[PDB]
């Protein structure tokens, strides 16, 4: 695989969004992955409606602002036959009744692919597919205050994840400890968090924060 990958430079990635005070990170992760795969297919980058997922994908198992899963979101898009654009179905950070309108659908998928729970497999997926939906253990103050560099939290869990995010690439930089590899991760806490909304998560360090434990992408 390549040593460095950044799908932002290929046009696959929309700007950083902000989920607010709603537990809807799974929806932002899913829209990020579907935005990348739709661009791969059509060459058009169109921001997708997280609110559509929050309001409408309960039957696939999601629970709105109380949590959900990216795979359930991909299943909704397939079962529902579409997903509205962000412009047409804007984000309100609160769960409401479903207002999906197929006339404004701009995305589709035919299912999803779950990646084996290994960072080596996640690397191959990122290198060949595009941005990948992942879940991480973000429940640490160090993550809130992250500003730059490679994020490494000794107390991070590799099994209990609480936050869906999007891997848009990976790379390296020289560090004091010579743990130099990172996943380039798009968060949904706005651009004031981290590095313009992004974090460099430790890569190849025992599946740090569980980044390879629940990785998937939609088939387009």
Numbering used by the authors: 1 to 220
What does the paper say about this structure?
Several drug screening campaigns identified Calpeptin as a drug candidate against SARS-CoV-2. Here, we have further investigated a potential dual-targeting effect of Calpeptin and, indeed, show the pico-molar inhibition of cathepsins by Calpeptin, its sulfonated prodrug analog S-Calpeptin, and the chemically similar prodrug GC-376. Binding of the activated compounds to Mpro, CatL, CatK, and CatV was characterized by X-ray crystallography and their antiviral activity against SARS-CoV-2 was confirmed in cellular infection assays.
The active site of CatL is formed by two loops of the L-domain (Gln21–Cys25 and Gly61–Leu69) interconnected by a disulfide bond and two loops from the R-domain (Ile136–His163, Tyr182–Ala212). The catalytic dyad of the active site are Cys25 in the L-domain and His163 in the R-domain. It should be noticed that small molecules like PEG fragments of the crystallization solution were found in the S1’-pocket. According to our X-ray crystal structures, chemical modifications of Calpeptin to enable interactions with the S1’ pocket of CatL and beyond may increase both overall affinity and isoform specificity.
